[PDB]
Design a protein around this nucleic acid. Sequence first.
RNA 1: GGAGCUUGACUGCGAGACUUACAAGUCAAGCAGGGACGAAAGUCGGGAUUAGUGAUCCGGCACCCCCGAGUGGAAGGGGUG
RNA 2: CGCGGCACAUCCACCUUGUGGUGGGUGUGGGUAGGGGAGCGUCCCUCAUUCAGCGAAGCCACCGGGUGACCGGUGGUGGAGGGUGGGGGAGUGAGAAUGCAGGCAUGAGUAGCGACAAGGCAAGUGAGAACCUUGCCCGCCGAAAGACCAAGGGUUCCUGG
RNA 3: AUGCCGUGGUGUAAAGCGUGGCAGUGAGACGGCGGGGGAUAAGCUCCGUACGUCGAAAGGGAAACAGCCCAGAUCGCCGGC
RNA 4: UAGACGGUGAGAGCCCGGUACGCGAAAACCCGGCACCUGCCUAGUAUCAAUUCCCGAGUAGCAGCGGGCCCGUGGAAUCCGCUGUGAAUCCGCCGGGACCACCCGGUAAGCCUAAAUACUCCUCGAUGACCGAUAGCGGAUUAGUACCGUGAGGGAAUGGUGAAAAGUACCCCGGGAGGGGAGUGAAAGAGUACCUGAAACCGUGUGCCUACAAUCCGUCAGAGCCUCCUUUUCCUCUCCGGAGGAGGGUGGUGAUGGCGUGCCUUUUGAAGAAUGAGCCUGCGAGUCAGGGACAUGUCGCAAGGUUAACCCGUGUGGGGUAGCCGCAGCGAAAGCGAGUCUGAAUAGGGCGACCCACACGCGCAUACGCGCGUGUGAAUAGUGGCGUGUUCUGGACCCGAA
RNA 5: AAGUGUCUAAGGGCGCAUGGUGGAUGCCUUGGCAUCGAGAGCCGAUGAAGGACGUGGGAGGCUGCGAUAUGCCUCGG
Lengths: 142, 122, 62
Amino acid sequence: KLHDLRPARGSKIARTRVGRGDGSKGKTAGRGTKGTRARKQVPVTFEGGQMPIHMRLPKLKGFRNRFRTEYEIVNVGDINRLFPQGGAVGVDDLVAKGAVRKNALVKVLGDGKLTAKVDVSAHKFSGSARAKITAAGGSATE
Amino acid sequence: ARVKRAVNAHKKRRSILKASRGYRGQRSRLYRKAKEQQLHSLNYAYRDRRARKGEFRKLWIARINAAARLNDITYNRLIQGLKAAGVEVDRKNLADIAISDPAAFTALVDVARAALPEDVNA
Amino acid sequence: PKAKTHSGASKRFRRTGTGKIVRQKANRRHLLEHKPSTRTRRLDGRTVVAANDTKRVTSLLN
RNA sequence: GGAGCUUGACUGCGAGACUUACAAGUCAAGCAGGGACGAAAGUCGGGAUUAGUGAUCCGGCACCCCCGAGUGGAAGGGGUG
RNA sequence: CGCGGCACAUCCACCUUGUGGUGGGUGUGGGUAGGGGAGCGUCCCUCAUUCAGCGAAGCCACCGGGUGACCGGUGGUGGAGGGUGGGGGAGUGAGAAUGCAGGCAUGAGUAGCGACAAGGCAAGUGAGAACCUUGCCCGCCGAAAGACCAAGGGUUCCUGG
RNA sequence: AUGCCGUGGUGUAAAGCGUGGCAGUGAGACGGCGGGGGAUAAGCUCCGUACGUCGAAAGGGAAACAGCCCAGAUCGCCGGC
RNA sequence: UAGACGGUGAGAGCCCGGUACGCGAAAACCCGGCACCUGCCUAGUAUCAAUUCCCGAGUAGCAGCGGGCCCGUGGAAUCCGCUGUGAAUCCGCCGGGACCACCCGGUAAGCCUAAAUACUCCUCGAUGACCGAUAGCGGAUUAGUACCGUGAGGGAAUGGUGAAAAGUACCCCGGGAGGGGAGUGAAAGAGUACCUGAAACCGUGUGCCUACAAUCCGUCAGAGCCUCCUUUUCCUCUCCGGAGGAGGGUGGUGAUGGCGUGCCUUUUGAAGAAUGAGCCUGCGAGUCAGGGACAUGUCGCAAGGUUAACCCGUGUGGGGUAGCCGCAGCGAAAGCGAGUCUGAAUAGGGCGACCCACACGCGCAUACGCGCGUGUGAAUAGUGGCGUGUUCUGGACCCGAA
RNA sequence: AAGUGUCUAAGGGCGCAUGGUGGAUGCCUUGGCAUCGAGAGCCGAUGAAGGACGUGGGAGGCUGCGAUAUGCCUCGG
């Protein structure tokens, strides 16, 4: 019951109250100084006055393409163990098994020996994926 | 949750004051002045018990020297002789003997004198 | 209410697929007549963050 | 010090070390291409060495289909110098 | 060094042999800033349990206990809400900020008592009179300390208590 | 001479390295030993030592005494060396 | 169908006001319903040739100066405003991020539009791990009052008798207040200045030391008295008591000796002649929100995990798959994939994958292991919540300027 | 003769007993803060909000009230 109900050993760490005497933590308590740190927190960015690393280092080159359609990546080894009987592989089926993000286009990698002779109804297969699928005896789609 | 922090503090106040009783003026009346004195008093007790032990050695030595001089012998040669005799007797009870039974002290002096070799050469 | 990422850090540092951060070196945008190809090759490329400020940088990015 | 022929006062890399708070600086055998001197072996990624220099952002010239706010182009931006 | 009591690492042999502990050995244990670990205590909600107008809390004194923060018992005051344990949550622990609110101290029964116009006596009211009332003297301003208006104040004018 | 790097043994309890978490310091002083600045100066100031102490260390001694000599307090003891 | 709270002489289901629950509105108001009253229509729907007109004007758009939208005049679109100029009505005009051809979409410069959303002076009913008189609104009490200020404005303190006033009849000192004796009363040790009644502070009675002696006003040794008390010589009075005393042991006091330079802060450094505090009581200074971030410990799950807003319901439980982190990363980007990039290629290099005490099939090897598969059962992990420490924006540990 | 030699407390100190001052702690509440749900969300030239003056058998203030003045008339409780 509740009177036998206990917290887990090692959890429920007591709050270290700070400004409660010298035996508990101290009068200055961490801020054992008289400078800025004693009275206020200096921004983590500020180095001292010299140019911080944020301006000292050069700007990361390049840009970012707005029209970049990122594809989700499906492990053919995961196909091998997930559907050892083959038969048919749908995207709805793969997400039903939780192997890939929902509502997204996919790609197939070839890292893993494929033995399951199964056609895959999906998108954008790699050349090595075609090598493994045709090795098993299946067919690529898009 | 206001807690009214009086009670917890009062435990300290009444404890320190009841221990501090007997001190003169603003020592046995004021908490914050008494507190100072307990710190000084107890640091003093801390070193004074040890100094006390040394002090008692000084007293015992003086008395042994007095009785020894009454038997025409110095403390130096007295202890040297007793060590040569193996008489592992402390200065507390030796000084006691000096009062309870001076004759026993004289006997120990004769033992030391006989045990001492001959002179100051080696 | 919600953390902010330092925009310069997001525009200068690039996190990799693991717990590593790299810094672009480019002390080569002003004068390039006196610098040898040795020096420009030392600057060319991308260099892991030295371990002497990662405890700061990771908080600057996050 | 002196003389003849030349342009390596190059390209894309450079393991591994020194040094150093960091940035930064400094050396690097050897390899691919292509070339100079050399009958050859071999030397050459500026000056006997160390001083002659200046982070970031932004802007400018040339070049590389890298993108191109529905498409095809362009403005602009991006990469190398 | 010796003799006893606490503690921290490591080690030896064990019990649930890295969770957690038992017996023993060696070494270690001055310490601010600072890190880490393990705890006491006031208040409050809940659960189990419970003393309690045959006298709780709070407070006071005494005797005891714990390595410490602190705890218990007895007795007195008081007269209604507190203990034990497992948990939860803090407006949670004051000796100091020329700190704040309140009360009282030292200074100290010291200074000071307010234009360099002056009071005195008698009788009397009254428990009580230098200071009030009524008489008799003295003194002072008298182009103001006199006598009337305005502003202002807002009953301070009279009677009785 | 010392000292520094590295190497093969002996010896040692934790001292080291790497990667993380959280802070302090970022005003030093004195003495001894080498110096420089100064006047052959200073309780002056500026340097080095894996030289020490105080700072952050009580105790005993230097009459008194943070920095000198000895010595690093767990507690108790009317016990010793 | 009442055990919610509160009151009543103390802790009440059954004493009381009430609650559960059921009744209950002349009149007024609000809402809803019904009738009257008010008000709209003698159709432009459909097929068609496309000669003609129209679809909001000093408007749009353009130029200049400005605003604002992530967008700081910049390559600067959309939107709004000002100033000049100044078009068209379907083969039209504007927008789709300078801009232009094509394509999709909608037809501006005219009006109105409830719900979902926000707020509480005020009025209901309820709640509270909110306060209990120095707290809570500043204001529990003649409170935005007394009071300060020219004024705008600023802006206090004072709670509690006892169940019931039963507020001490009467007497006696005293001018009275006040006090004592009586008395009510459970109690006056609850008397209007009052529940409990600490400390500072004041004072009295009494045990002990002190007027030839200096020292943070103590500590440790430490005699003699005082008080409590055991044994005991002893009083034999003994069915009592233990008187006074030796010795022993508590609680006070303390002669006299030794030792010893207040506390905090800040300081290289302090007993201070560096600062600060007159004392006592009370008040008060590192905390919280966030599906924040980083790290760590425990607890759920297990290549998954997890739900926010929101719906239902009665306590905060059941649902809700939009989304997030992980799962494959590299590259400026296109892109391709265990490779990828620079690069003619990479022989090399930046980044990430793959660890055996080992068998079976197999090349090499004296022995030792390189490699493709199954295990001789070989190597492994993230996510969320509650805690801890730090950190970011939030008044950010507190107080304090000119 | 020479020497030893307790005893003073004017007035202070310490500790006990007993009082006073003060009103802290404890317990309480005619009182407030912050919230969920449900209403209302306007008043006013018909003289609003809010106020001065005045009104009671009896001095003053607060609440209510307005020369009809701690109240009037009507329907209900």
